Design a protein around this nucleic acid. Structure first.
Lengths: 89, 102, 77, 46, 63
RNA sequence: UAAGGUGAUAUGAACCGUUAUAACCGGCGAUUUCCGAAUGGGGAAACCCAGUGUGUUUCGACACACUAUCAUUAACUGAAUCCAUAGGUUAAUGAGGCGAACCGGGGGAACUGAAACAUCUAAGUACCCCGAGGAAAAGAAAUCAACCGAGAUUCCCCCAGUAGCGGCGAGCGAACGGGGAGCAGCCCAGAGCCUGAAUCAGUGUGUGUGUUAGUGGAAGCGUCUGGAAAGGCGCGCGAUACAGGGUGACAGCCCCGUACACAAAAAUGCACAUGCUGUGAGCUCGAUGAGUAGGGCGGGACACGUGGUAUCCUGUCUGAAUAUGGGGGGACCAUCCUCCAAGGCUAAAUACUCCUGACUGACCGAUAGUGAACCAGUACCGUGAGGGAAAGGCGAAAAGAAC
RNA sequence: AGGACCGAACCGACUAAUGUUGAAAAAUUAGCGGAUGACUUGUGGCUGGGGGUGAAAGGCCAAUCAAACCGGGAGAUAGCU
RNA sequence: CGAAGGUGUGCUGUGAGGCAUGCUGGAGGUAUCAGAAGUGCGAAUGCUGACAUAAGUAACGAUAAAGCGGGUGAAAAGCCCGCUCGCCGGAAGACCAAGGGUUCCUGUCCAACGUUAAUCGGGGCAGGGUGAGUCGACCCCUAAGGCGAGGCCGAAAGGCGUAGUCGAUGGGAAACAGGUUAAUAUUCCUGUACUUGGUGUUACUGCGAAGGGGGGACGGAGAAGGCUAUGUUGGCCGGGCG
RNA sequence: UACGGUGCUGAAGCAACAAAUGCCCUGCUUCCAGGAAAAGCCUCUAAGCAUCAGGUAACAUCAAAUCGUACCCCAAACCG
């Protein structure tokens, strides 16, 4: 079918920062940069398919891009999506 | 289609190095050629700490124009001009004033 | 619009000329009248917005031919 | 003093937005003029 | 890869090579964003690789 | 085609290549997210929400497709109402929107001039709207002419600032005729002698010339100044090539080219020979465009402002003869002359340039030339329609100044 | 009960002073009027230029009004500077 | 072995001008005789750029108000910390809507911006931060009103309008307390809950709409009663004994 | 102790009075100026269906998607 093509196309990167690492250590939660559309069902299916780990719930958000000044020009960065995936215990 | 190719030996016609011959190493898209060991510049290279950090005044070879070079012959011993001749299907270069293939 | 179904008369423009020749833009409207014609070939009344010269056209050549022309050009009735 | 511009994005998009200009014929001519001039912001939509 | 080895392949063998290229691209960009992958060019080539497969899949399955 | 490349600011890293499926260019294919005529419904554009159907299912769901309105046609149904329409449903085909100028039509100003102004002019101009094409419209004499004749329409130069029109003011202003560019004539209103007849559109085929990548393309060295030679000086060669650009100063002989000779697997536009689909062609017999021509009224166009104003067009009311007939020949009548209205189609000469290609300039050279040589219809101003800038130059080469 | 009374929020704008190249292209300060109504306010609609709307001043219609603003006739016209 | 340009000097013509030359510049200039002009500026409250003048003058934006110690630094009235002082407290406090758009937090820099300095910042640069079945939107439903198949009207554009379909400023299910980050929390975590659908079984049983009825579903003012939010005092508990 | 603050235990945790402009109260009285609509919700049946389908009731289960969530918000962040 075409489901596994979508599941491989959803995930982009794991996010890395202090809040991501602290949520991983305490709350058993991985933070992922996902696709822009990327619903919670597609994210949960993709993590359970491509990391072979069981997944409890997904909280997503859309991070807005910051207007950066380069020389004299102004460029708004990409709007991307972030997913806090809570695994099992 | 390029007369002066990469592993050639050419003699410089005009410049601070008129007459000095040498090997080509790099031709650029600009219509310029780096000839090995003629057009030397003293670049005041800055040391970069977040890399290997040499610094120092470095001799580089500057780009020379392709019209300033001409292919050395070592049959007549002077600069010659290069033409394009059609043998069996590959296009070859041929020397002028002696119709010989490079 | 004020358009006869048979003849196709539309309001044209023109001038109110006065006795001092002061022109004013005016309209010439057709003498349009919504009339019901009897049609033996359809055994019914067809309501057309016709002019009086349109009724003289229908009174000269019959309504079976004028409705054929309206069927021909693509208008409805 | 209360000034002449008191903003609201709903009245903005309902009066000067793209669908409002694309409704009427003169607004489509406004869009045609904005395209022929070559403007980068066609309407005020965002 | 090249065109002709894929041009001799079946439809469903092209499909499993498509899925293999998708898994390969997934692992590659995971290594790229993680801090691995000194050799970035693989990313680009695997991208064009998938396009090659998909092009033949639009010729072989029907057009 | 090719030994180099992975677009630019712009490096860098990691790589792909070199006798040929690296890159690059050209033809044809594939992909083509969402908005936009936006076409499934809606909407504050780039969003929200579906329906029906088919198949992939680990049963939580996915995927593909279709679903706008209008017009034409066909088929099912089907009201008051009996039949039948109206209406409802499905199918197939077309249209929709955008674009610089040109073209035709439906409307349509005023500033201004008249040294005020109202008729007039400006001006059928601007502007609005509708429609089509590569051109469009007009077009085959119910025309002009003058008792001699010319032979459809369009454009140019005269006639001619002439006759005329004109508060006879301001102004507007022909035609006849002549010289040219370009040439083309037909079909229906109907029957019988026939069915590929003189031919056009729609498909293939062959050839030629084009277009879309490209290939070959001649012949100069020494010496002095110089940062650097292409300059000066000296001695040679090419030239169907001394057009142009670049190369460290001014190059025919250093490079790219130019004159010249060539080059297409595939797509092609053009005109040539032929094969089908439809349509007839060639003869005699007849017909030969009715609410029409003309009239009364009110307007408009004709250069012609109602004047003695012919002619054309209509809003309104009327209303013939019909080839023993009818129109026109500038009031009108008679005689002659000339043509046949109320049905159509038609190429070239002509107008225009968003864009593409080459070339030119007693055109401009950064306050100029486009508003914009520069990431410009941008920053900025305005709710909005809309307005709208300034801003080029190191060097031959970054050798862009280590310490 | 009240287009009742006193008086905060709220709405207004009577007087004075300051400001007058302001802190502000209409304000501040101290007093002032209404403050259960013909009140006031948020949000969204509708009316558009010889037009709207006007408890009427030619007032207001985006700091513009005895006819807005933008673009076009248009380089209007100027016996005047 | 040095053009146009720029800048001095000296000759020369009745004048507009001309010629030579020193310095800078570093690549073009152009006789003579003809030809054409975007052909000569001091003025137009001329247009654009630059720079003066008033002049180191006014002013530095509420008369709520600061003082000191230590830090950090090259530099401290202004930043950080601490002690006092003063100002608001129906706000000059704490939440949101509208509207902005990253201004939020951390590290770092002081050219510009801040009417002064700045080590500071709502500034520059980089990194991080917005977690929802219950909150708001989306969604169901309508008001004013918009669009509007057909339709009716209109030179054309278009106007109005029925069926419909939008339109919140209104009506419609569901979550609280505590803890946590430098930055989120009714969203994360802990504890305890709630709502609406789809699917499966088990029983009883008539279900069914676009239609009928109820309900949703409503004004100003006034007065009293029951209460709570909240506050004050006592009791209790921990500390003090100045 | 990074000196900012993190880690563990943690007593009582009651009564009386006062009290709203908030809740009962979309109530009650009164007046004239006579005070939205529709759906969710409840109920009735018509066409239809009646082994079922559907409904009621209990239980198990799965789903609740998408968008906003920072910060200012009587203000140095909106309009001037």
């Amino acid at each position: 079918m075409i489901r596994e093509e979508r599941l491989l196309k959803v995930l982009r990167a794991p996010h890395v920062s202090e809040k991501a690492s602290t949520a991983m250590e305490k709350s058993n939660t991985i933070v992922l940069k996902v696709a822009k559309d990327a619903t919670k069902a597609e994210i949960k299916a993709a993590v359970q398919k491509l990391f072979e780990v069981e997944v409890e719930v997904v909280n997503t958000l859309v991070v807005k891009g910051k207007v950066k000044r380069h020389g004299q020009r102004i460029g708004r960065r990409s709007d991307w999506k972030k997913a806090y995936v809570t695994l099992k215990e | 289609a390029a007369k002066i190719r990469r592993d050639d030996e050419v003699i410089v016609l005009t410049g601070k190095d008129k007459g000095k011959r040498g090997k080509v190493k790099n031709v650029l898209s600009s219509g310029k050629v780096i000839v090995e060991g003629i057009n030397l510049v003293k670049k005041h290279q800055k040391p970069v700490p977040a890399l290997n950090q040499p610094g120092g005044i470095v001799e580089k070879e500057a780009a020379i124009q392709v019209s300033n070079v001409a292919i050395f012959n070592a049959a007549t011993g002077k600069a010659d001009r290069v033409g394009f001749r059609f043998e069996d299907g590959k296009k070859v270069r041929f020397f002028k004033s002696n119709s010989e293939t490079i | 619009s004020r358009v006869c179904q048979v003849t196709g008369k539309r309001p044209v423009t023109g001038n109110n000329r006065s006795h001092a020749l002061n022109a004013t833009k005016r309209r010439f409207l057709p003498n349009l009248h919504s009339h019901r014609f009897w049609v033996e070939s359809e055994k019914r009344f067809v309501t057309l917005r016709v002019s009086a010269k349109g009724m003289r056209v229908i009174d000269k050549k019959g309504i079976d031919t004028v409705l054929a022309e309206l069927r021909a050009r693509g208008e409805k009735y | 003093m209360k000034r002449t511009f008191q903003p609201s994005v709903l009245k903005r998009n309902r009066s000067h937005g793209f669908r409002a200009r694309m409704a009427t014929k003169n607004g489509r001519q406004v869009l045609a003029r904005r395209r022929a001039k070559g403007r980068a912001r066609l309407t005020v939509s965002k | 890869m090249k065109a002709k080895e894929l041009r001799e392949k079946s439809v469903e063998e092209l499909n499993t090579e498509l899925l293999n290229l998708l898994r390969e691209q997934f692992n590659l960009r995971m290594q790229a964003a993680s801090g691995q992958l000194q050799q970035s060019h693989l990313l680009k080539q695997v991208r064009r690789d998938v396009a090659r497969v998909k092009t033949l899949l639009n010729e072989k399955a029907g057009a």
